[PDB]
Amino acid sequence: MVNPTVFFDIAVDGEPLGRVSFELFADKVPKTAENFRALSTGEKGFGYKGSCFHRIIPGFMCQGGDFTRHNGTGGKSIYGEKFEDENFILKHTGPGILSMANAGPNTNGSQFFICTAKTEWLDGKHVVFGKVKEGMNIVEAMERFGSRNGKTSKKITIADCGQLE
Structure with a gap:
């Protein structure tokens, strides 16, 4: 086997x-x-x-x-x-x-996050299970639609997603 590769096609207000x-x-x-x-x-x-x-x-x-x-x-x-x-x-x-x-220990559902920086204070609190392979430039672009409190200025959606390898 080999670790699987999945993708997200991101859109901004479509x-x-x-x-x-x-x-x-x-x-x-x-x-x-x-x-x-x-x-x-x-x-x-x-x-x-x-x-x-x-x-x-x-x-x-x-x-x-x-x-x-x-x-x-x-x-x-x-x-x-x-x-x-x-x-x-x-x-x-x-x-x-x-x-x-x-939402605390042993409460994993479907929500996840992509880090844009080292966040060591989350170590031991959140389960790390993957990493960006391609498109870090797209993640940086998404980051420009965020804010300090997290509210996004435009809707950042997953237009499509699936498995590559």
Whole structure:
């Protein structure tokens, strides 16, 4: 095997921005990687396609994944609703890190965030499970639509998403 690669085609108020591809560390966090992969392909009948990045903070991160409530309070995993923190082997070492958002210990659903900088204070609190492979320039572009409190100036949506490799 080899770690899977998924992609997100980002749009700003419908206007295509570009593609961001991610390598999912299935070799270190198989359960967390699988949740993201399946939600990216939409194979379970629900997922990221059509959802938006509701919280974008410049110099920090781009958060999304709430396909149920579309406001940062919903979303769900492919294992029911919420699942345990698999492990904290990987750290938020720098820009491009893909990690799970949560509401405290063992509350992983579908929400995730892409770091635009090293965020060591999240180590041991959020499960790191992947990283940007291609399109970091697109993530930087998305970052320009965020604000200090996270509210986005325009709607940043996942026009399409799926698996490449």
